[PDB]
Design a protein around this ligand. Structure first.
Ligand code: B12
Ligand code: B12
Ligand code: B12
Ligand code: B12
Lengths: 193, 195, 193, 194
């Protein structure tokens, strides 16, 4: 019920209602749970409604901007330990950022200093920041497959000592082609580190 | 002065330090003060450092993502009062969003329910949402001039009962060509709407 | 917010109190709301009690409310793997918010602080530390009397590191009891790292 | 069995695992059900393990602090309706608080503004807060019998127009002596108020 209620509140511009329903989900499912059982299903349904032609981009934007804000709050409430950061972003041309934010969140919740950069970072710039910050790892979220298919073989090799790639747009073959370690589960990311 | 310290902390990935310095600014200068004297100058300097080749886009992204989060907090503090919403966004092709967020903040501070959509909204979709929600106005932030130049004469005219345009990419002539009311100053935005 | 929050609590307006606390959180940040809102309100409640302006029930109400808010923040910090740091108060010490604050500051810096609750008998504390391979024990003393009740060296070897702080603690008493004295919550994470 | 798994996770200081298992119980049984099928059995078992010398007080504390946090989430989810509050606490000397929290939860679920004070409230102070808030009722949870035995005849009378007493430490005779209405069932609490 909270998912439908939340989507409906957003689609009618009822931010207060949407906030109350999100907080309810947080209290019931917990931090990781609200993301899996509320934030993610609502975003999926928004995307499907858009793809079906039922809503425009403005409705989609409204819901995503709201949910991004909520996730950013949770991100900031997680610990940020000292020590070599893990840089988190998306490939050049990838502007879906919530998957990356989720990765940063799960890492921080497990005591890893994940620096979320925002999406869509050119690889030379990403490499330079990693080298300058002594980053132990880089993590990339790919929602679309096209930004990965545009990259040359081995492009993600050595962005940092460890490079992880995951998301709906990514598969093990593409990761291998690009020279990244493929990760299927957000919970396996912390383990790998 | 906090600006230098804040930028330095960000560029070395010291989020906690950056947050402490921003909070210090908030406690000393207040919300409006910290926006004018800390958030805006740091963003301008990051842009200039990028343009001069001193930092890459990753550093720029980091600072902007951090400052967006801080402004989002302020936006939520300003509240979302009842009444017909004002939709706030940027023109198609404009992905700089902090100006729009600032406009939403200033409106909310004056009791106007500014719904920030995110950036880069197609005009017919924006118009449809305004109609469906009974929005009293639309506000657009233009940082680049090119997204405005791409638009046909009068394109902004009827997005909602009132349409406001401002930002670095906007000027009075272009606003007039596009049929929007041109606004220089964020704080007079709520006044313009009331009047 | 401090006055508004105390006034809301004293009228039994929990919803209003929650709204005002959330405002403080958004403005000051997590550590800031503790320093600028939670701590001043608790000190003022204590002073009002001591002056006979309110009774213990009003004090209970405010502390139970603020404990719940701190517990939320604690749960949102996330819990990293690795040897825990056990956090509690000395036997006879029932003021627990100082201990919760210590656990919070540790978790915010990526230290797995296990908050046990207050008032833990020392043999039981030592046994759990041993059994979990805890790297440290942290004690918050608000009153001085629970420390005075302990024999010389009583806190020695609870764990490889034992830290004592709070209003009821001073360096001489820490030395008598065989604990390391800590003045600042911010120095605690440093000492461990 | 989620109960065994949850207790084991707690006893080894695996908070993340404990939280996951509790959330699983919540998703499966729902709020009332997780209390009956998971929270309460685990607390009872912790007490028995302590009494048998298998665990110390630190393990017991850890489990109850965790489960108190979960119940606090449920209390806040139940919401806090407007109107004259019902104050909920425990007798002076009674430091077991989860029974009181449960009473507050069941009341809130039925639309009663149950204000949970925390445990162990001196009676003059409790009376004064009831007076100051215009409370319609006071509810006390007694786990131990000794805190009640220590109280004078009629000590609970007129804390508010309705005063309820229940829990393992309470019986109808002691309630009568103290001037409280005795309640056996948490679900009967809201009924009794009407
Ligand atoms: C919101 C949204 C947008 C927003 C994003 C705003 C923002 N700042 O993030 C905007 C407006 C920018 C947008 C634009 C477009 N997008 Co879009 N949109 C979405 C939507 C509705 C939600 C996105 C989201 O946050 N979802 C949550 C995602 C990230 O979760 P998830 O992928 O299920 O993630 C899980 C796993 O992948 C894993 N994971 C993710 N990252 C990582 C990383 C690691 C290391 C690991 C281990 C795991 C992991 O974590 C999650 C597990 O719970 C989706 C719908 C959907 N996703 O089903 C589309 C969707 C992805 N978008 C789509 C499209 C087509 C577009 C556009 C092409 C449309 C257009 N031409 O304008 C553009 C492309 C822009 C670009 N260059 O990227 C399509 C893509 C379909 C396809 N055929 O591939 C989708 C699926 C919608 C649809 N049903 O068609 N979009
Ligand atoms: C962060 C940033 C980005 C981020 C944006 C991230 C996000 N927002 O989500 C990213 C990396 C995506 C980015 C990309 C690019 N950007 Co950029 N970057 C910036 C930077 C540093 C941000 C500034 C900011 O957010 N400030 C807040 C804005 C609004 O500041 P402001 O315009 O001074 O705002 C004042 C007024 O305009 C007014 N205002 C603003 N909006 C409104 C609305 C109303 C109604 C009113 C009354 C007032 C008002 O209020 C403010 C205070 O007085 C700026 C530097 C700068 N000086 O702005 C550039 C800058 C704007 N970017 C620039 C460029 C060139 C680009 C790119 C083309 C770079 C590239 N080759 O990829 C792309 C284009 C993306 C697009 N739009 O299509 C240039 C533009 C220069 C120009 N050509 O005019 C700048 C100025 C950097 C520079 N000095 O060279 N950018
Ligand atoms: C709430 C409260 C209670 C509640 C606590 C409920 C709970 N926590 O579960 C209850 C009702 C139980 C209570 C009871 C009593 N308390 Co009382 N009460 C308080 C009150 C109002 C707030 C306590 C609190 O959370 N403070 C927040 C604390 C932690 O803040 P702080 O001490 O300034 O802590 C800072 C530093 O110490 C540091 N820190 C803390 N711990 C640690 C640990 C480390 C390692 C480090 C580095 C730093 C650190 O962090 C904080 C911020 O910097 C205070 C008022 C006050 N001034 O504190 C009294 C107060 C502590 N109580 C007091 C008294 C006298 C009592 C009782 C004896 C009275 C009574 N009989 O009712 C009992 C004793 C119970 C017992 N312990 O055995 C007095 C103590 C005065 C004295 N002589 O020392 C106080 C000061 C009130 C007063 N003005 O008289 N109390
Ligand atoms: C956690 C706990 C503690 C914690 C409590 C922390 C806290 N903040 O709550 C701590 C460590 C502080 C503690 C201390 C002690 N406790 Co203890 N501990 C427990 C334990 C394991 C769980 C308590 C709990 O939350 N129970 C959940 C409750 C609510 O379940 P329940 O009581 O069956 O309640 C049901 C009904 O009574 C009803 N109900 C409850 N309240 C109300 C009110 C109304 C109006 C209604 C209608 C119904 C109702 O609803 C509940 C669900 O059906 C129990 C084990 C147990 N079986 O209860 C003991 C237990 C209660 N403790 C016990 C003892 C002995 C102690 C100590 C004396 C030990 C000591 N030597 O120091 C002290 C006394 C402290 C004090 N002065 O109050 C004994 C009491 C035995 C007895 N009476 O003879 C128990 C039974 C353990 C055992 N021996 O097996 N304890």
């Amino acid at each position: 019920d909270l998912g439908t209620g939340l989507l409906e509140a957003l689609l009618r511009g009822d931010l207060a209602g949407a906030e109350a329903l999100f907080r309810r989900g947080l209290r019931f499912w917990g931090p990781e749970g609200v993301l899996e059982h509320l934030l993610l299903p609502v975003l999926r349904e928004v995307g499907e409604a858009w793809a079906r032609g039922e809503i425009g981009v403005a409705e989609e934007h409204l819901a995503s901007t709201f949910l991004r804000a909520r996730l950013q709050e949770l991100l900031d409430l997680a610990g940020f330990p000292p020590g070599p950061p893990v840089l988190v972003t998306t490939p050049p041309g990838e502007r879906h950022e919530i998957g990356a934010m989720l990765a940063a969140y799960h890492l921080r919740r497990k005591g890893v200093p994940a620096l979320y950069l925002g999406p869509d970072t050119p690889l030379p710039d990403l490499r330079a920041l990693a080298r300058r910050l002594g980053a132990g790892a880089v993590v990339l979220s790919a929602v679309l497959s096209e930004p990965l298919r545009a990259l040359p073989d081995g492009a993600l090799k050595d962005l940092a000592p460890r490079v992880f790639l995951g998301g709906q747009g990514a598969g093990p073959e593409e990761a291998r082609r690009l020279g990244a370690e493929y990760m299927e589960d957000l919970k396996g990311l912390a383990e790998a580190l």
